Design a protein around this ligand. Structure first.
Ligand SMILES: Nc1ncnc2c1ncn2[C@@H]1O[C@H](COP(=O)(O)OP(=O)(O)O)[C@@H](O)[C@H]1O
Ligand code: BEF
Length: 1143
């Protein structure tokens, strides 16, 4: 083309006049036309990710990025070993590959690596036709460094179960099972982390060492030798020398890598193929050197703590001059967006930048510049769309500009006068003047719409995965056995206690008195919820305290049972309501919203709209973190409410945020004809009466106000929608007082963080719940600083935000000394313009200075906790508090996250009085809030607050209490028992808990042996599932799953399955208790059985000696069933024949 290609160690090519996103075009071109692999060096790893898209967007050659360590140099955490997988694979094949593009940032090119002899000297291949021992391969894996686990879920672990060994290779992404057979590899089956069954069988597998360093005995001794040669040992049970010598691995041990090879580690340059070409963008002569400075700076910063010392930086990272010399050994190309006219191997190819093409909604012709420029472009114009649906979203836009470009795949496909489009993540369009090509990106006109996972992958907390993290069976966590009391779970054990070895779950009580409970009676154990995992009560066994507490609870539930019998339903007398939504009308309202919702916001919208469309009323928690645009869900709910004209009301515990919602709703409905108004202290009673009259006649649909409505004064013609914000700070019977008016109203519970009782109820599932863990695009984190009382940090932070041009939120929490403090901090900060705010003011100047804050005429505001509700403006970007000894975690997090709603990094300066003046609980609160600082932190903080404040009375008042109440589920058990007492009118009795659906014990061992399943959690899960079976199809699929996950089925397993099947069939039949032994047994029916009495008596008289009706419902039979198989077959055929003549 316009230039040659550089192939020489010293050859350097330099290219200029290269606009943004044309670097990708040039890179793809040269890689496709370069006879050899391509390695690209990027200045910023994040930028490299961007490259990883656009390159793959424009070409089809395999493009990969060097997996890199996430942690900062000399950190105290592992590199998140999963990433290591993606690394090692690329390392293993790296020498042997001809075409392909590998992209690396300089910060990781700076890092030393393994010698690859260590790598491919340990690179095993397992093949079908191999007579290899299970144990030999086991020890082989152990030497390789794979970790022995029992429920493999991650990279680099292996588990065993009888003849079935399974593991996860470090190179591939899916684990594998083997199915050994006579020490022969019979199968090699891939299986998902959650299917635990075959997806397919592959002929052979290749596996790589577990880590980036050996871990055999030779490795340990070499490491110890190097250590004793270099550093100084400390005789200590956590000094990494002793910890390594023990056998384990320190968390950060990966940074002490050069102590494992007795060699200078390669600079990774040896791994380049014999014929490569370096291509470089930006510049390294600043990035690499600044990185070296940062590494040494952090090193010297942490040159303390003799336990866990640090290597010199030069031993692990390279030198800059050495890096330059090394790169001068390969041909290299450099790209920059400047003018280099001198002289050869240096060109300036026409890649003009995109002109100012954009769309303006206010203009009558948004695509004015677009249509002006399209017709002035003689060449083809090709658009790029980052997704699929958006393509149509822009095709309609092209219909507004009356053009239908054809979708192409490659840039060369463009004709002379051709308009086209393609799916790509390109950022900036441009004008390739070489052949007059116009490339257009979405941001060219749309602007900023970013949906990538900008946040760190590890920096995420899934709510459902947090519940599934564990809900049972932690070896120390407490549980409650309703018969006796509360203890700590300790595990499983098999016991021979009557000639049949049965499983038993063992609990421990006070004074170390153990209690084993049979596995079958599992439904008598509840997971503790009193929230005292470290200070919980420990009932001493055989005491009356638990019985007394249970009797008190029984009395309380009987009282509330009468109360519910007043309603004559289990909160079920309600029929609800159905809303009608017009999809086009709602879509029009979506159009009136000038934003794009996050995916979880869209999910919440779908859930709420569907639920209201259902003919039942809602009680739905939308508990997401602040700054997630929760209010817009309410806006759309109110729009659909006014579509039905259902007189929606809204509640908030303040006047500031009430006014905020008022103006927001006015903005949403300044185009839609509908009446929005407010009723609170600000309004005069003269107009409050008018508001009440208007809402009595129904001329008002949207009302915003505080507790004035729940004063038996407001009248609604048709109250159909009620909204509540910030459920916290609300006492009980507020919701009951607002519910009393109309039962079938849709309840929408908006909040930022639930109080412990509400959170526990959400966990119970009795109330609908929803979480939005998807922050807006530009909502970066909020910095937090827990500092002691310094008068200078506050002043300098105030000045830092003033020079930024923002507003400071000053918290002192006083209505007397706030006056003096305002002038005190004015003297401290003469540059500051301050207003005084407190809730004990006439509210006229309050709203006036709120308006002033909207205009930002004064910078820092002193206020009490009325600020907590929050009307945050994006201008405000910093909060300094004064009292940090008494504030709830919910308030702390809420005021932390209240700042932002903008692209600019906010701040949260936290001022504390003397540490010794702090009580223990204050220290715990402050250390907890400091420990967590990231997006999606409110929900996890609420989970932590659970077990701290403790869920309160699930029945009585005073929520969020840590009293000694019975757990959660037992309350529901007694409630349904009393509902039975009401429906059947039966007497209250503590016997329904002592339940018995069907007992089919026959003195025959039946259990899931631990050898057949290693762990206990899965064993108990299957125990519960089998106990709660409903049809023989369930049993069949369970048997299939057991076959998959654990191979063959032991005799006890088969017996358990068939006993469950027989219990199922007997429950279908109508018999309740079928018992027996070797010499015979008894059959006992129900009150209304379905066995034919005629033939029943016929059998009775046919063989009275072998059959005797001894009791109103008891049939005694004698049988010589010395074989378990004979016993089971006899009973099966007996019951089958009995039910054959079923009446
Ligand atoms: N997906 C989004 N992208 C950009 N900005 C958003 C998004 N969602 C919300 N916002 C902005 O952030 C602000 C959040 O205010 P609000 O609805 O009160 O959030 P929260 O109720 O969580 O405090 C809104 O005023 C809105 O303008
Ligand atoms: F209700 Be929010 F957090 F604005």
């Amino acid at each position: 083309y316009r230039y040659t290609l550089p192939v020489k160690a010293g050859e350097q090519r330099l290219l200029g006049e290269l606009t943004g996103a044309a670097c990708a075009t040039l890179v793809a071109e040269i890689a496709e036309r370069h006879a050899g692999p391509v390695v690209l060096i990027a200045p910023d790893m994040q930028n490299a990710l961007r490259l990883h898209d656009e390159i793959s967007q424009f070409t089809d050659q395999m493009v990969m990025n060097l997996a890199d360590w996430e942690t900062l140099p000399y950190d105290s955490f592992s590199p998140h070993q999963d990433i290591i997988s993606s690394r090692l694979s690329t390392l293993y094949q790296l020498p042997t590959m001809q075409r392909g593009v590998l992209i690396v940032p300089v910060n990781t090119l700076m890092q030393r690596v393994c010698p690859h002899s260590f790598l491919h000297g340990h690179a095993l291949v397992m093949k079908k036709g191999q007579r290899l021992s299970r144990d030999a391969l086991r020890t082989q894996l152990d030497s390789a460094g794979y970790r022995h686990v029992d429920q493999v879920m991650e990279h680099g672990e292996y588990a065993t179960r009888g003849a079935l060994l399974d593991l996860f290779p470090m190179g591939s992404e899916l684990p594998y099972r083997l199915d050994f057979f006579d020490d022969e590899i019979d199968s090699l089956r891939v299986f998902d982390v959650d299917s635990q069954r075959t997806l397919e069988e592959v002929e052979a597998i290749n596996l790589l060492p577990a880590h980036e360093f050996p871990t055999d005995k030779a490795a340990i001794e070499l490491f110890r030798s190097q250590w004793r040669d270099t550093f100084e040992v400390k005789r200590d049970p956590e000094h990494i020398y002793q910890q390594v010598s023990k056998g384990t691995l320190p968390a950060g041990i990966e940074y002490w890598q050069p102590l494992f090879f007795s060699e200078p580690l390669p600079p990774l340059f040896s791994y380049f193929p014999a014929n490569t070409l370096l291509v470089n963008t930006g510049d390294l002569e600043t990035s690499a050197e600044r990185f070296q400075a940062d590494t040494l700076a952090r090193f010297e910063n942490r040159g303390v703590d003799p336990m866990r010392p640090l290597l010199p930086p030069q031993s692990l990272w390279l030198r800059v001059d050495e890096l330059f010399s090394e790169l001068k050994n390969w041909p290299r190309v450099q790209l920059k967006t400047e003018h280099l006219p001198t002289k050869a191997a240096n060109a300036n190819l026409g890649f003009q930048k995109l002109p100012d093409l954009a769309v303006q909604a206010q203009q009558k012709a948004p695509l004015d510049a677009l249509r002006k420029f399209l017709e002035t472009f003689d060449g083809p114009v090709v658009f790029s769309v980052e997704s699929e649906g958006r393509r149509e979203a822009l095709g309609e836009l092209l219909a507004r500009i009356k053009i239908a470009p054809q979708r192409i795949m490659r840039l060369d496909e463009a004709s002379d006068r051709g308009r086209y489009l393609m799916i790509g993540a390109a950022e900036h369009g441009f004008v390739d003047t070489v052949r007059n090509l116009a490339l257009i990106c979405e941001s060219d006109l749309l602007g900023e719409r970013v949906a990538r996972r900008r946040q760190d992958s590890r920096r995420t907390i899934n709510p459902d995965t947090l519940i599934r993290n564990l809900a049972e069976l932690h070896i120390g966590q407490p549980v409650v056995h309703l018969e006796h009391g509360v203890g700590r779970y300790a595990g499983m054990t098999t016991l021979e206690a009557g000639g049949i070895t049965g499983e038993y779950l063992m609990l421990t009580y006070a004074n170390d008195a153990k209690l084993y409970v049979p596995v079958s009676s599992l439904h008598l154990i509840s997971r503790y919820a009193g929230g005292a995992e470290e200070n919980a009560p420990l009932h001493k066994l055989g005491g009356d305290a638990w019985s007394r507490a249970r009797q008190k609870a029984a009395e309380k539930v009987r009282d509330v049972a009468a109360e519910l019998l007043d309603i004559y339903a289990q909160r079920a007398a309600k029929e609800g309501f159905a809303f009608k939504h017009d999809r086009e009308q709602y879509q029009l309202f979506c159009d009136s919203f000038p934003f794009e919702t996050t995916p979880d916001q869209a999910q919440a919208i779908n859930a709420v709209l569907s639920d209201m469309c259902q003919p039942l009323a809602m009680d739905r928690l939308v508990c997401g973190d602040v700054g997630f645009g929760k209010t817009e869900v309410a806006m759309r709910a109110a729009f659909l409410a006014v579509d039905n004209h259902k007189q929606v009301a809204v509640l908030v515990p303040t006047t500031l945020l009430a006014q905020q919602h008022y103006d927001n709703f006015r903005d949403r409905f300044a185009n839609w004809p509908v009446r929005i108004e407010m009723i609170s202290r600000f309004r005069s009673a003269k107009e409050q009466t008018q508001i009440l009259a208007e809402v009595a006649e129904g001329k008002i649909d949207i009302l915003i106000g505080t507790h004035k409505l729940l004063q038996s004064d407001v009248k609604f013609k048709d109250l159909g929608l009620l909204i509540v914000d910030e459920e916290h700070r609300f006492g009980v019977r507020h919701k009951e007082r607002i519910k009393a008016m109309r039962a079938n109203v849709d309840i929408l519970t908006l909040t930022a963080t639930p109080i412990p009782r509400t959170l526990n109820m959400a966990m119970s599932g009795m109330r609908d719940l929803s979480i939005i863990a998807t922050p807006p695009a530009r909502r970066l984190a909020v910095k937090t600083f827990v500092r002691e009382y310094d008068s200078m940090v506050v002043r300098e932070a105030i000045l830092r935000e003033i020079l930024r041009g923002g507003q400071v939120y000053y918290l002192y929490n006083d209505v007397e000394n706030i006056q003096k403090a305002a002038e005190r901090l004015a003297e401290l900060v003469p540059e500051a313009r301050i207003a005084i705010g407190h809730g004990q003011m006439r509210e006229r100047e309050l709203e006036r200075v709120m308006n002033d804050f909207h205009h930002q005429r004064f910078n820092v505001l002193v206020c009490t906790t009325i600020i907590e509700t929050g009307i945050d403006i994006p201008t405000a970007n910093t909060i300094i508090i004064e009292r940090a000894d008494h504030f709830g975690l919910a308030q702390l997090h809420q005021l932390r996250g209240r700042v932002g709603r903008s692209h600019h990094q906010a701040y949260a300066w936290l001022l504390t009085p003397h540490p010794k003046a702090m009580t223990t609980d204050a220290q715990k609160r402050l250390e907890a809030i400091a420990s967590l600082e990231d997006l999606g932190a409110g929900f996890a903080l609420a989970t932590h607050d659970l077990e701290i404040r403790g869920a309160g009375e699930l029945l009585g008042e005073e929520q969020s209490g840590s009293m000694e109440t019975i757990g959660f589920s037992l309350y529901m058990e007694l409630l349904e028992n009393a509902v039975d007492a009401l429906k059947a009118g039966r007497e209250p009795s503590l016997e329904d808990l002592t339940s018995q659906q069907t007992e089919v014990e026959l003195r025959m061992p039946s259990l899931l042996p631990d050898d057949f399943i290693p762990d206990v959690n899965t064993r108990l899960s299957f125990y519960k599932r089998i106990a709660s079976a409903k049809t023989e199809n369930e049993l069949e699929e369970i048997k299939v799953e057991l076959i998959d996950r654990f191979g063959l089925l032991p005799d006890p397993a088969r017996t358990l399955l068939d006993i469950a099947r027989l219990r199922q069939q007997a429950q279908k039949l109508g018999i309740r208790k079928l018992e027996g032994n070797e010499k015979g047994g008894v059959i006992e029916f129900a009150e209304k059985n379905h066995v034919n009495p005629a033939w029943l008596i016929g059998l009775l008289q046919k063989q009275p000696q072998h059959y005797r009706l001894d009791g109103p419902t008891r049939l005694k039979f004698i049988q010589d069933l010395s074989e378990r198989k004979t016993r089971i077959e006899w009973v099966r055929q007996f019951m089958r024949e009995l039910e054959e003549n079923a009446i």
